[PDB]
Write a protein that binds this ligand. Structure first.
Ligand SMILES: *[C@@H]1O[C@H](CO)[C@@H](O[C@@H]2O[C@H](CO)[C@@H](O)[C@H](O)[C@H]2NC(C)=O)[C@H](O)[C@H]1NC(C)=O
Ligand SMILES: *[C@@H]1O[C@H](CO)[C@@H](O[C@@H]2O[C@H](CO)[C@@H](O)[C@H](O)[C@H]2NC(C)=O)[C@H](O)[C@H]1NC(C)=O
Ligand code: NA
Ligand code: NA
Lengths: 266, 266
């Protein structure tokens, strides 16, 4: 089956996109990125935002552990940095410490008593105080024997305006490169040329990281690649890169109904 | 000040984007579109999704009423239709009835004991059973003496693939035409030509509806129009349309920090 990851958490409620446990139980995925943690440039404690799944999300603990028991990695995405004009000391250091204590120590944090597998950073602006590359360095230099995977979700345009500094730390394990919405590098009908060139650029310029092609599971999003095109046309070309890792599915909501991941080649 | 509306509800928590009451109290807006209600193609009761603002959102009642007391209209956006392959009878009729009872009757629904001012529909796919134009007709033919405003948020491409049928009912009071993200009709630096042509097309083809130009409040989104450009370059041209209504701000989160609406001409 190879490596197929998925985003979950912003697809509505358990009714609309399924529980986290349902996603894991499906067997389609070996990694899930939870969307998303809101962080504060002024150092206020982060706010978890799993939409209509939960407000008290501590009961997700058992679902996270169920997933991990099935060898599925669970990463939390930082999706929003609320900016401040105030100059505040130690914001990045303090966020790293907050994350370590609340998600990477088995202690009672917003997702219950878990050890998550890592942190993803969305392609969004950093703060005047909170800096992504500094955060990546801090997390990797965490006082723990646990492995904290670090990743980012840049758009397919290289360099990514928001994430390039974090990428150039050389400390990201995975990149989920987004080939959806309107960008010059997405697949369009009968035209993978720009996608191929972008994949060449990402794989060659970030040889230290595993590169995922993040694709939409619905034809109602720009960048959609029909499964036969993906299997016969795209994967044969992009898999020539030694650091091509697999496909990241945007997102669990669309995949739950479309069963796109089910149609990807073995 | 004219007509300035804003989207609120998907900007995170009260910490990140402010409470609904804060938005109303700011005095920047005369209409707020709440994002967003999830509806079900199989007829399951809708799920409210105000992200990390609340799970039990009934206490928003007092904030909605405070807003309405300041002559601010509050509309709820349908942002997601969860599809089914099942053929289910009366889905659209039953949704209209659910909305009437739960948001337009002063009874105890998901937002407490309110009479909302209307319903907006996002540019998203309808269902195999739930149909937007039929929903608009049903809501307008509601057994009530209350005014239910109906609107949609099409992208700037005309016709809008998802919403054109609803628009052609001629029963939409407002259109919030979205000139952001990557589309051929957005403003780009020194180039309003495509935006002007799109505004001409929308205003001339939908003369029965009030047309809002929905714009991003942050330079970090495609389509951003610097305030001086908006005031001196865009508004003088587009305001020549008799049905040009004003500016819709995407969104309260960005506006709270950028104060974009504050910089729009009187
Ligand atoms: C920071 O990055 C380094 C390099 O990837 C990680 O070091 C690896 O750790 C694993 C398990 O601890 C070892 O099996 C490897 O031998 C290490 N590799 C190297 C090159 O030293 C380290 O674990 C990361 N820090 C965190 C908190 O995950
Ligand atoms: C359906 O649309 C019609 C037309 O816009 C609305 O009828 C108006 O209602 C207001 C207040 O009830 C009256 O002042 C107007 O005279 C009516 N206009 C016309 C042309 O009849 C009607 O209210 C809408 N239905 C709902 C539930 O809002
Ligand atoms: Na879709
Ligand atoms: Na921004």
């Amino acid at each position: 089956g190879g490596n197929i990851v998925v985003y979950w958490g912003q697809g509505g409620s358990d009714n609309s996109e399924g529980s986290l446990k349902e996603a894991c139980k499906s067997g389609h995925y070996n990694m899930i990125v939870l969307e998303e943690l809101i962080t504060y440039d002024n150092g206020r404690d982060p706010d978890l935002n799993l939409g209509a799944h939960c407000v008290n999300c501590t009961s997700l603990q058992q679902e996270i552990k169920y997933c991990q028991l099935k060898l599925i990695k669970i990463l939390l995405q930082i999706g929003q940095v609320t900016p401040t004009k105030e100059d505040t000391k130690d914001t990045t250091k303090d966020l790293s410490q907050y994350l370590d204590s609340n998600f990477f120590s088995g202690k009672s944090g917003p997702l219950g008593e878990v050890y998550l597998d890592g942190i993803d950073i969305a392609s969004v602006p950093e703060g005047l105080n909170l800096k992504f590359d500094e955060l990546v360095q801090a997390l990797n230099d965490s006082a723990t024997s646990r492995r904290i995977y670090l990743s980012a979700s840049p758009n397919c345009v290289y360099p990514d305006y928001y994430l390039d500094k974090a990428i150039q730390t050389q400390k990201l394990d995975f990149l989920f490169v987004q080939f959806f919405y309107a960008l010059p590098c997405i697949y369009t009908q009968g035209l993978p040329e720009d996608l191929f060139q972008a994949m060449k650029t990402w794989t060659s310029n970030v040889p230290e990281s595993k590169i995922f092609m993040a694709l939409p599971a619905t034809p109602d999003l720009n960048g959609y690649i029909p499964p036969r095109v993906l299997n016969k046309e795209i994967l044969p070309a992009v898999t020539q890169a030694s650091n091509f890792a697999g496909v990241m599915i945007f997102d669990r909501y669309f995949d739950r109904f479309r069963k796109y991941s089910s149609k990807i080649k073995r």
